[PDB]
C-alpha cells in the first residue's frame, strides 16, 4: 500500500492540531494539548488509489537540532498553515517554507499553503494576498476551517496530489 508522509507546520494556534483531528476523527476540538507533537495514520482513497496518510502534527520548543532536521526531512510534503485572522502567522510562512527548503535541500518540495479559520469573521489576511504568495511559491492555496470542515479534505488530498506529481519527476 502506498504511504504518504505529510507534515503540518505553522505558527502556534493556527489550528494544525484541529485540522489533523478533523481529518482523522471528523470532530472539532476546542482545545488540543500544546505539548503534543505526534503522527497519526489514516487510510483513505484518493483518485481511486487506496493510501495510508501519516500526518505529523508539529509542536514543541523552537529548536534546530540535527535530530529535528532529520525528523522534518522525513516528510514528503508539507501543509504550511496560517490563520486568516492572524497576520503574524501569515508573515511566518516564509520562515517555514525556508526551513523546509533547507532540510530538503530543494526548491521543489510538495507544499500546500493553508489559510485556516475561514469560518471566523475577523479576517486580516485577504484571499488575494494568500493566492499571490502561493503563486510566487508555485504551490496551491486552500482556505479551510477545522470547525466546519470546509476545505479540510481538499487541503490534505491536494498535498497528496502534489507529492504524486513530484514522484513522477
Ligand atoms: C508552541 C509550538 O508548538 N511551536 C512554536 C511554533 C511552532 C511550534 C514549534 N516552534 C517553532 N517555531 C518556529 O518559528 C517560530 C518563530 C516565531 C518566534 C521566533 N520564530 C522564527 C520565526 F519568526 C517564527 N520554527 C520552528 C521550526 F522551524 C522547527 C523546525 C526545526 C528544524 O530544525 C527543521 C525544520 C524543518 C522544517 C520545518 F517546517 C520546521 C518547522 C516548523 C523545522 N521546529 C519548531 C519551530 C515554536
Ligand atoms: N473558529 C475556529 N477555531 C479554530 C479553527 N482551527 C483551530 N481553532 C481553534 O484555535 C485554537 C488553536 O487550535 P490548535 O489546533 O490547538 O492550533 P495549533 O497550535 O496550530 O495546533 C483552538 O482553540 C481551536 O479550537 C477553525 O478553523 N475555526
Ligand atoms: Mg497543536
The Cα 71–Cα 81 span in angstroms is 19
Residue-by-residue DSSP string for 81-143: EEETT-HHHHHTHHHHHHHHHHHHT-S---EEEEEE-TT-S---S-HHHHHHHHHHHT--EEE
146 is in an annotated binding site: yes
94 CB under 6 A from ligand 1? Answer: no
Q: Domains along the chain?
A: 1-167 (3.40.50.300)
**For residue 80, which phi and psi values (nearest 5 degrees)?**
-100, 105
Neighbours of 57 (CB within 10 A): 23
> Which ligand is in closest contact with the Cα of 73?
1
- What experiment produced this structure? X-ray
What's the distance, CA 16 to chain centroid? 7
Q: All 3 cell numbers of residue 135?
A: 503563486
Q: All 3 cell numbers of residue 103?
A: 532540510
- Resolution given for this structure, in angstroms: 1.7
What residues contact 139, with CB distance under 8 A and at least 6 apart?
111, 112, 113, 162
Amino acid at each position: 500500500m502506498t504511504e504518504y508522509k505529510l507534515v503540518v507546520v505553522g505558527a502556534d494556534g493556527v489550528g494544525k492540531s484541529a485540522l489533523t483531528i478533523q481529518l482523522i476523527q471528523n470532530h472539532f476540538v476546542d482545545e488540543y494539548d500544546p505539548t503534543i507533537e505526534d503522527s497519526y495514520r489514516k487510510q483513505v482513497v484518493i483518485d481511486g488509489e487506496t493510501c495510508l496518510l501519516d500526518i505529523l502534527d508539529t509542536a514543541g520548543q523552537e529548536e534546530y537540532s540535527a535530530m529535528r532536521d532529520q525528523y522534518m526531512r522525513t516528510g514528503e510534503g508539507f501543509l504550511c498553515v496560517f490563520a486568516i485572522n492572524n497576520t503574524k502567522s501569515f508573515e511566518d510562512i516564509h520562515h517555514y517554507r525556508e526551513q523546509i527548503k533547507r532540510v530538503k535541500d530543494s526548491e521543489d518540495v510538495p507544499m500546500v499553503l493553508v489559510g485556516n479559520k475561514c469560518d471566523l469573521p475577523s479576517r486580516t489576511v485577504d484571499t488575494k494576498q494568500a493566492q499571490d504568495l502561493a503563486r510566487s511559491y508555485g504551490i496551491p492555496f486552500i482556505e479551510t476551517s477545522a470547525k466546519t470542515r470546509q476545505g479540510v479534505d481538499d487541503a490534505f488530498y491536494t498535498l497528496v496530489r502534489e507529492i504524486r506529481k513530484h514522484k513522477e519527476k
